[PDB]
Protein backbone atom coordinates (compact mmCIF):
# COMPACT_ATOMS: atom_id res chain seq x y z
CA UNK A 1 0.00 0.00 0.00
CA UNK A 2 1.31 3.40 -1.24
CA UNK A 3 -0.47 6.78 -0.73
CA UNK A 4 -2.08 8.68 -3.61
CA UNK A 5 -1.29 12.37 -2.66
CA UNK A 6 -2.43 14.76 -5.38
CA UNK A 7 -2.38 18.58 -5.47
CA UNK A 8 -5.65 20.20 -4.48
CA UNK A 9 -4.75 23.81 -3.70
CA UNK A 10 -1.82 26.23 -4.11
CA UNK A 11 -1.77 29.04 -1.54
CA UNK A 12 -0.22 32.32 -2.73
CA UNK A 13 0.11 35.48 -0.63
CA UNK A 14 3.53 35.66 1.08
CA UNK A 15 5.91 38.05 -0.76
CA UNK A 16 9.10 36.34 0.61
CA UNK A 17 10.16 32.69 1.42
CA UNK A 18 7.68 30.70 3.51
CA UNK A 19 9.49 29.26 6.56
CA UNK A 20 6.94 27.01 8.32
CA UNK A 21 3.39 25.60 7.92
CA UNK A 22 1.34 23.98 10.79
CA UNK A 23 -2.26 22.61 10.95
CA UNK A 24 -4.31 23.71 13.97
CA UNK A 25 -4.96 20.73 16.38
CA UNK A 26 -8.76 21.12 15.69
CA UNK A 27 -7.96 20.49 11.95
CA UNK A 28 -9.77 23.68 10.76
CA UNK A 29 -6.78 25.89 9.93
CA UNK A 30 -3.31 26.13 8.50
CA UNK A 31 -0.90 28.80 9.84
CA UNK A 32 2.11 29.92 7.79
CA UNK A 33 5.12 31.99 8.82
CA UNK A 34 7.41 33.78 6.33
CA UNK A 35 10.61 35.85 5.79
CA UNK A 36 8.10 38.71 4.90
CA UNK A 37 7.57 39.09 8.75
CA UNK A 38 3.99 37.88 8.48
CA UNK A 39 1.86 35.07 9.77
CA UNK A 40 -0.99 33.98 7.44
CA UNK A 41 -4.05 31.89 8.32
CA UNK A 42 -5.72 29.59 5.72
CA UNK A 43 -8.64 27.11 5.69
CA UNK A 44 -7.17 23.57 6.03
CA UNK A 45 -9.61 21.88 3.63
CA UNK A 46 -10.29 24.58 0.96
CA UNK A 47 -7.00 26.56 1.06
CA UNK A 48 -9.12 29.74 1.44
CA UNK A 49 -7.02 32.70 2.72
CA UNK A 50 -8.34 33.75 6.14
CA UNK A 51 -6.19 36.60 7.61
CA UNK A 52 -2.73 38.15 8.12
CA UNK A 53 -1.18 38.55 11.58
CA UNK A 54 1.65 41.17 11.84
CA UNK A 55 3.97 42.60 14.48
CA UNK A 56 7.43 41.03 14.15
CA UNK A 57 10.18 43.51 13.17
CA UNK A 58 12.07 40.87 11.14
CA UNK A 59 11.24 37.58 9.36
CA UNK A 60 9.79 34.53 11.15
CA UNK A 61 11.41 31.04 11.03
CA UNK A 62 8.69 29.13 12.90
CA UNK A 63 5.09 29.15 14.13
CA UNK A 64 3.17 26.70 16.44
CA UNK A 65 -0.44 26.35 17.72
CA UNK A 66 -1.72 25.97 21.27
CA UNK A 67 -3.63 22.64 21.97
CA UNK A 68 -7.06 24.39 21.99
CA UNK A 69 -6.14 26.02 18.52
CA UNK A 70 -6.78 29.59 19.95
CA UNK A 71 -3.19 30.82 20.17
CA UNK A 72 -0.08 30.87 18.04
CA UNK A 73 3.56 31.32 19.01
CA UNK A 74 6.03 32.62 16.38
CA UNK A 75 9.91 32.56 16.41
CA UNK A 76 11.63 35.55 14.70
CA UNK A 77 15.03 36.92 13.61
CA UNK A 78 14.00 40.02 15.68
CA UNK A 79 15.27 37.90 18.73
CA UNK A 80 11.77 37.55 20.18
CA UNK A 81 8.83 35.19 20.21
CA UNK A 82 5.26 36.53 20.12
CA UNK A 83 2.07 34.96 21.50
CA UNK A 84 -1.00 35.69 19.42
CA UNK A 85 -4.72 35.39 20.04
CA UNK A 86 -5.78 34.02 16.58
CA UNK A 87 -9.45 35.28 16.41
CA UNK A 88 -8.59 38.88 17.35
CA UNK A 89 -5.08 38.95 15.77
CA UNK A 90 -3.80 40.59 19.02
CA UNK A 91 -0.24 40.12 20.22
CA UNK A 92 -0.75 38.84 23.84
CA UNK A 93 2.96 38.71 24.80
CA UNK A 94 6.39 39.46 23.37
CA UNK A 95 8.92 36.88 24.73
CA UNK A 96 12.33 38.57 25.21
CA UNK A 97 15.57 36.99 26.37
CA UNK A 98 17.29 35.40 23.38
CA UNK A 99 20.38 37.28 22.22
CA UNK A 100 20.17 36.04 18.59
CA UNK A 101 17.61 34.78 16.03
CA UNK A 102 14.84 32.69 17.56
CA UNK A 103 14.66 29.72 15.17
CA UNK A 104 12.12 27.22 16.50
CA UNK A 105 9.22 27.05 18.97
CA UNK A 106 6.48 24.79 20.36
CA UNK A 107 3.74 24.78 23.03
CA UNK A 108 3.59 21.85 25.44
CA UNK A 109 0.32 19.72 25.39
CA UNK A 110 -1.18 21.57 28.44
CA UNK A 111 -0.18 24.79 26.49
CA UNK A 112 0.84 26.60 29.71
CA UNK A 113 4.50 26.46 28.46
CA UNK A 114 6.40 27.43 25.31
CA UNK A 115 9.77 25.97 24.32
CA UNK A 116 12.06 27.93 21.94
CA UNK A 117 15.44 27.36 20.29
CA UNK A 118 17.84 30.04 19.05
CA UNK A 119 21.11 30.85 17.18
CA UNK A 120 22.31 32.03 20.66
CA UNK A 121 22.74 28.21 21.36
CA UNK A 122 20.20 28.10 24.16
CA UNK A 123 16.77 26.49 24.71
CA UNK A 124 14.33 28.64 26.70
CA UNK A 125 11.18 27.56 28.57
CA UNK A 126 8.52 30.28 28.84
CA UNK A 127 5.35 30.77 30.87
CA UNK A 128 2.46 31.45 28.39
CA UNK A 129 0.28 33.45 30.86
CA UNK A 130 3.03 35.82 32.13
CA UNK A 131 5.42 35.88 29.14
CA UNK A 132 8.32 35.28 31.55
CA UNK A 133 11.30 33.02 30.79
CA UNK A 134 11.10 30.22 33.40
CA UNK A 135 14.43 28.49 32.43
CA UNK A 136 17.38 28.99 30.10
CA UNK A 137 18.99 25.63 29.26
CA UNK A 138 22.73 25.81 28.20
CA UNK A 139 21.61 23.28 25.57
CA UNK A 140 24.17 23.33 22.81
CA UNK A 141 27.43 24.80 21.44
CA UNK A 142 25.85 25.86 18.08
CA UNK A 143 22.45 27.15 16.78
CA UNK A 144 19.41 25.17 18.00
CA UNK A 145 17.57 23.92 14.94
CA UNK A 146 14.46 22.35 16.62
CA UNK A 147 12.61 21.96 19.95
CA UNK A 148 9.62 19.70 20.67
CA UNK A 149 7.73 18.49 23.78
CA UNK A 150 6.72 14.83 24.13
CA UNK A 151 3.06 13.55 24.55
CA UNK A 152 2.69 14.52 28.25
CA UNK A 153 5.06 17.55 28.09
CA UNK A 154 7.49 15.99 30.67
CA UNK A 155 10.31 15.96 28.07
CA UNK A 156 11.84 18.36 25.56
CA UNK A 157 13.89 17.17 22.60
CA UNK A 158 16.38 19.69 21.04
CA UNK A 159 18.69 19.50 18.00
CA UNK A 160 21.66 21.64 16.93
CA UNK A 161 24.34 22.30 14.29
CA UNK A 162 26.71 20.87 17.02
CA UNK A 163 25.60 17.39 15.83
CA UNK A 164 23.63 16.52 19.00
CA UNK A 165 20.04 15.70 19.98
CA UNK A 166 19.35 16.23 23.67
CA UNK A 167 16.45 15.10 25.87
CA UNK A 168 15.57 17.49 28.73
CA UNK A 169 13.37 17.09 31.81
CA UNK A 170 10.74 19.90 31.48
CA UNK A 171 10.38 20.35 35.27
CA UNK A 172 14.09 20.45 36.35
CA UNK A 173 15.77 21.61 33.15
CA UNK A 174 18.23 18.70 33.48
CA UNK A 175 19.79 17.03 30.43
CA UNK A 176 18.54 13.45 30.52
CA UNK A 177 20.17 12.09 27.29
CA UNK A 178 22.66 13.05 24.54
CA UNK A 179 22.28 11.16 21.20
CA UNK A 180 25.58 10.49 19.41
CA UNK A 181 28.68 6.98 14.36
CA UNK A 182 29.49 10.66 13.49
CA UNK A 183 28.14 14.16 14.41
CA UNK A 184 26.89 15.96 11.18
CA UNK A 185 24.80 19.14 11.97
CA UNK A 186 21.30 18.16 13.23
CA UNK A 187 18.79 20.29 11.29
CA UNK A 188 15.51 18.92 12.75
CA UNK A 189 14.15 16.70 15.55
CA UNK A 190 10.74 15.66 16.95
CA UNK A 191 9.16 12.96 19.06
CA UNK A 192 6.88 10.32 17.55
CA UNK A 193 3.14 10.64 18.47
CA UNK A 194 3.56 7.88 21.16
CA UNK A 195 6.72 9.59 22.52
CA UNK A 196 8.90 6.43 22.34
CA UNK A 197 10.97 7.49 19.29
CA UNK A 198 12.64 10.65 17.90
CA UNK A 199 12.85 11.48 14.17
CA UNK A 200 16.10 13.43 13.46
CA UNK A 201 17.38 14.95 10.22
CA UNK A 202 21.05 15.66 9.54
CA UNK A 203 22.76 17.77 6.86
CA UNK A 204 24.09 14.63 5.14
CA UNK A 205 20.73 13.87 3.27
CA UNK A 206 19.61 11.48 6.03
CA UNK A 207 16.58 11.14 8.33
CA UNK A 208 16.83 8.78 11.29
CA UNK A 209 14.34 7.13 13.63
CA UNK A 210 15.82 6.77 17.09
CA UNK A 211 14.75 4.95 20.18
CA UNK A 212 15.44 7.53 22.85
CA UNK A 213 15.76 5.29 25.89
CA UNK A 214 18.20 2.82 24.39
CA UNK A 215 19.99 5.39 22.29
CA UNK A 216 19.60 3.15 19.22
CA UNK A 217 18.96 4.02 15.54
CA UNK A 218 16.01 1.94 14.36
CA UNK A 219 15.39 3.29 10.87
CA UNK A 220 17.28 5.39 8.28
CA UNK A 221 15.47 7.22 5.38
CA UNK A 222 17.35 8.60 2.32
CA UNK A 223 16.85 9.45 -1.39
CA UNK A 224 16.07 13.17 -0.72
CA UNK A 225 18.42 16.22 -0.69
CA UNK A 226 19.15 17.94 2.67
CA UNK A 227 22.55 19.63 3.20
CA UNK A 228 21.84 23.34 3.80
CA UNK A 229 18.35 23.84 5.26
CA UNK A 230 16.45 23.00 8.45
CA UNK A 231 13.61 21.10 6.79
CA UNK A 232 10.65 19.92 8.88
CA UNK A 233 9.87 16.19 8.87
CA UNK A 234 6.68 14.42 10.12
CA UNK A 235 5.03 11.12 11.07
CA UNK A 236 1.85 10.70 8.93
CA UNK A 237 -0.58 8.58 11.05
CA UNK A 238 -4.10 9.27 9.60
CA UNK A 239 -3.84 6.53 6.94
CA UNK A 240 -0.74 4.47 6.23
CA UNK A 241 2.32 4.96 8.49
CA UNK A 242 4.68 7.29 6.59
CA UNK A 243 7.57 9.69 7.12
CA UNK A 244 7.03 12.97 5.28
CA UNK A 245 9.78 15.51 4.54
CA UNK A 246 10.58 18.43 2.29
CA UNK A 247 13.78 18.38 0.19
CA UNK A 248 16.32 20.72 -1.50
CA UNK A 249 15.38 19.15 -4.90
CA UNK A 250 11.90 20.96 -4.59
CA UNK A 251 9.99 17.71 -3.83
CA UNK A 252 7.90 16.37 -0.93
CA UNK A 253 9.19 12.84 -0.06
CA UNK A 254 7.03 10.14 1.55
CA UNK A 255 8.59 6.89 2.94
CA UNK A 256 6.90 3.78 4.35
CA UNK A 257 7.97 4.16 8.03
CA UNK A 258 8.73 0.37 8.39
CA UNK A 259 10.38 -0.66 5.06
CA UNK A 260 12.19 2.75 4.61
CA UNK A 261 11.26 2.72 0.87
CA UNK A 262 10.19 5.93 -0.90
CA UNK A 263 6.42 5.48 -1.57
CA UNK A 264 5.79 8.95 -3.16
CA UNK A 265 7.55 12.08 -4.46
CA UNK A 266 5.42 15.23 -4.91
CA UNK A 267 6.25 17.55 -7.81
CA UNK A 268 4.96 21.12 -7.96
CA UNK A 269 7.24 23.44 -6.00
CA UNK A 270 9.89 25.57 -7.75
CA UNK A 271 12.23 26.12 -4.75
CA UNK A 272 13.42 24.16 -1.66
CA UNK A 273 10.53 22.53 0.21
CA UNK A 274 11.43 23.82 3.67
CA UNK A 275 8.32 22.66 5.49
CA UNK A 276 5.69 19.98 5.50
CA UNK A 277 2.85 19.31 7.94
CA UNK A 278 0.34 16.43 8.24
CA UNK A 279 -3.37 17.10 9.04
CA UNK A 280 -4.39 15.66 12.49
CA UNK A 281 -7.46 13.66 11.18
CA UNK A 282 -7.50 13.72 7.32
CA UNK A 283 -4.90 12.39 4.84
CA UNK A 284 -3.77 15.95 3.91
CA UNK A 285 -0.16 17.24 3.63
CA UNK A 286 0.65 20.98 3.57
CA UNK A 287 3.99 21.90 1.96
CA UNK A 288 5.84 25.31 1.82
CA UNK A 289 8.74 26.57 -0.32
CA UNK A 290 11.56 29.14 -0.28
CA UNK A 291 12.23 32.61 -1.82
CA UNK A 292 11.93 31.63 -5.52
CA UNK A 293 8.56 29.92 -5.05
CA UNK A 294 6.77 31.60 -2.02
CA UNK A 295 3.71 29.26 -2.23
CA UNK A 296 2.10 26.69 0.06
CA UNK A 297 0.56 23.48 -1.38
CA UNK A 298 -2.25 21.28 -0.02
CA UNK A 299 -2.20 17.63 -1.12
CA UNK A 300 -4.73 14.90 -0.32
CA UNK A 301 -4.76 11.05 -0.57
CA UNK A 302 -7.52 8.36 -0.18
CA UNK A 303 -5.18 6.50 2.28
Amino acid sequence: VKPNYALKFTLAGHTKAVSSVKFSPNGEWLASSSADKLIKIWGAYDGKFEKTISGHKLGISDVAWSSDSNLLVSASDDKTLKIWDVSSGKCLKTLKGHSNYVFCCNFNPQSNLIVSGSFDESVRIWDVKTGKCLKTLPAHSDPVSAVHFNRDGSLIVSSSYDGLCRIWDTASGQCLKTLIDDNPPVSFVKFSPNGKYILAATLDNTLKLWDYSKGKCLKTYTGHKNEKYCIFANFSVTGGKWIVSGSEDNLVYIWNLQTKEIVQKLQGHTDVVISTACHPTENIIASAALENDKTIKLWKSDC
Binding site: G59, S61, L203
Partner: peptide
Amino acid sequence: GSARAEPKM
Protein backbone atom coordinates in the same frame (compact mmCIF):
# COMPACT_ATOMS: atom_id res chain seq x y z
CA GLY B 1 14.78 38.17 6.48
CA SER B 2 14.34 34.77 8.15
CA ALA B 3 17.24 32.52 9.35
CA ARG B 4 15.51 29.29 8.27
CA ALA B 5 15.14 30.62 4.67
CA GLU B 6 18.98 31.09 4.45
CA PRO B 7 21.32 28.11 3.70
CA LYS B 8 24.00 26.88 6.11
CA MET B 9 27.13 28.36 4.46
